[PDB]
Structure 1
Amino acid sequence: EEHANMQLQQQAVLGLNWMQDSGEYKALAYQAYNAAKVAFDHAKVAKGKKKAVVADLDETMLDNSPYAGWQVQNNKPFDGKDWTRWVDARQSRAVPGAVEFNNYVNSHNGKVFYVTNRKDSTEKSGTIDDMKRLGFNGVEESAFYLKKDKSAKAARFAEIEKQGYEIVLYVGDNLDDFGNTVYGKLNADRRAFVDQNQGKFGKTFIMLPNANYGGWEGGLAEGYFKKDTQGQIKARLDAVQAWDGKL
């Protein structure tokens, strides 16, 4: 139903305006990357290890908001086939502060590795071209751990460690950018993970804001991503906590 597709995508509009237009969003990005530099400079690693920073790409270092805008204008639910075309379009932007932080790490005895769910086989060329264009240093192919067979990221983190790196901090917009312990879990478990790691945020786990999509969306209801459009609308509305209007 076109009506349902429209309602689902209209629900993203205000958060998209915030991400695309607000100074507040930029300020949060700068806050994150300012904190990240402090953490990187403070970090010490075990003898014999090289210093690594793990960074997510989508909505962490790369800004894909025009794809979300296209979804709104065309009443299009997320589809990986459209995403691949977006990546190939080579119109990604940089999240504020990301290039400077990336290049600083890479010139100060660290290496940023991009652990990203852009697809290795179909989305790599556009990703690398955009990052070169946007000014990122250190974007040789071996810096990337793009998605092959699994969206969960912990195994890729382990690959980096096997290459003699100690990961000093992680940057992301999704809790699944910090490990696998709440991957595929609902939001109660995800909030619990955050509470259990309260002191790490802004230190070793650096957060960027994303009000548009992520593991928190699937976290709204059991089986969310397999529901039809009407089901996803209902899951979102049922998750709302509302004042009853009384004293």
Structure 2
Amino acid sequence: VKLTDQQLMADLWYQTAGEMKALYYQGYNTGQLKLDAALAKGTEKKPAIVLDLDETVLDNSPHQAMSVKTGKGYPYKWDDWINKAEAEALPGSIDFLKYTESKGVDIYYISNRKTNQLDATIKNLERVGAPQATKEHILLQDPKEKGKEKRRELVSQTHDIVLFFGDNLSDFTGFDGKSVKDRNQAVTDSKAQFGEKFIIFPNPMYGDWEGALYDYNFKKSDAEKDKIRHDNLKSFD
């Protein structure tokens, strides 16, 4: 079984579809409207926004396409890709970030890139013209650190975080390590937050949605993942 072939359409959409680009504009347009509203309401502490990087601000889809062509899934040559520091900015992202900066609002890029990839991440953020591309504002994941809540909470000590941007539910608080059924119910329960506080972007290529299917154990064979993937489809009879 060529597992990587199973991602082809998802990758192709993400890389070529105008619809995908439109969804990125819709997210950043909505985020800017809500930033303005949050600034007009006012804050107790200095305002901040928090964004994920991969598939939120930086487009890593060329690595996923490399996996389709080679048949070798992530993280094969992921560090090689990160070190190249040539990911393009996703649609609307840079204009929104520059607008946020112009308003005096602090930005924190909270990303599960590893702390030892900081320098390459700064390089990529500089290449695309992302504001505040510094160690102070780029909060990467420690070895053995689970999730992003520690970094979210550190930011909240000194800022009021008015918006979160991400492609993965775990880019928002309260979606860590849940089963498919439980994370899906949590979405329903927090339905009012989406497009309000939590700004979501489309990523059918990879993420916690896939990891949840494997009980977050990625040490599964290609055949085992293939079976789980097939078993979790809901087919019409």
**TM-score normalized by the length of structure 2:** 0.95
SS in 1 for 2:165: strand
Corresponding letter in the other structure for 1:153: K
Per-residue displacement from partner, 1:196-223 (whole Å, max 9, x unpaired)? Answer: 1111111100001000000000112435
Give me the whole-angstrom Cα distance separating, in 2, the residues matched to 1:151 and 1:74: 30
Deviation at 1:190, TM superposition (A): 1.0
The residue number in structure 1 matching 2:164 is 170
Per-residue displacement from partner, 1:147-197 (whole Å, max 9, x unpaired)? Answer: 1131401110011112x1010010000000002x33122211111111011
The runs of at least 4 aligned residues of structure 1 exceeding 2 Å deviation read 44-47, 221-224
Per-residue displacement from partner, 1:125-145 (whole Å, max 9, x unpaired)? Answer: 221111111111211221111
Contact 2:179 2:213 in 1 (8 A): yes
Give me the whole-angstrom Cα distance separating, in 2, the residues matched to 1:228 and 1:112: 39
The residue number in structure 1 matching 2:129 is 135
The residue number in structure 2 matching 1:30 is 25
Contact 2:86 2:127 in 1 (8 A): no
Structure 1: gaps of 5 or more residues: none
Deviation at 1:60, TM superposition (A): 0.3
The residue number in structure 1 matching 2:104 is 109
Query: After the TM superposition, which residues 153-168 of structure 1 pair with which residues of structure 2 at under 5 Å, given as runs?
Result: 153-162=148-157, 164-168=158-162
Corresponding letter in the other structure for 1:240: L
Matched residues, number: 234
2:70 to 61, 67, 74: 74
The residue number in structure 1 matching 2:86 is 91
The residue number in structure 1 matching 2:61 is 65
Corresponding letter in the other structure for 2:159: Y
Give me the whole-angstrom Cα distance separating, in 2, the residues matched to 1:26 and 1:190: 26
Give me the whole-angstrom Cα distance separating, in 2, the residues matched to 1:117 and 1:220: 20
Corresponding letter in the other structure for 1:136: A
SS in 1 for 2:136: helix
Query: After the TM superposition, which residues 47-66 of structure 1 pair with which residues of structure 2 at under 5 Å, given as runs?
Result: 47=44, 49-66=45-62
Contact 1:220 1:236 in 2 (8 A): yes
1:17 to 12, 17, 20: 12
Give me the whole-angstrom Cα distance separating, in 1, the residues matched to 2:216 and 2:62: 28
Contact 2:165 2:198 in 1 (8 A): yes
Q: Among all aligned residue pairs of Structure 1 and Structure 2, give the percentage whose two residues are the same amino acid.
A: 36
Alignment of 1:183 onto 2:179: no
1:210 to 200, 203, 211: 203
Deviation at 1:50, TM superposition (A): 0.4
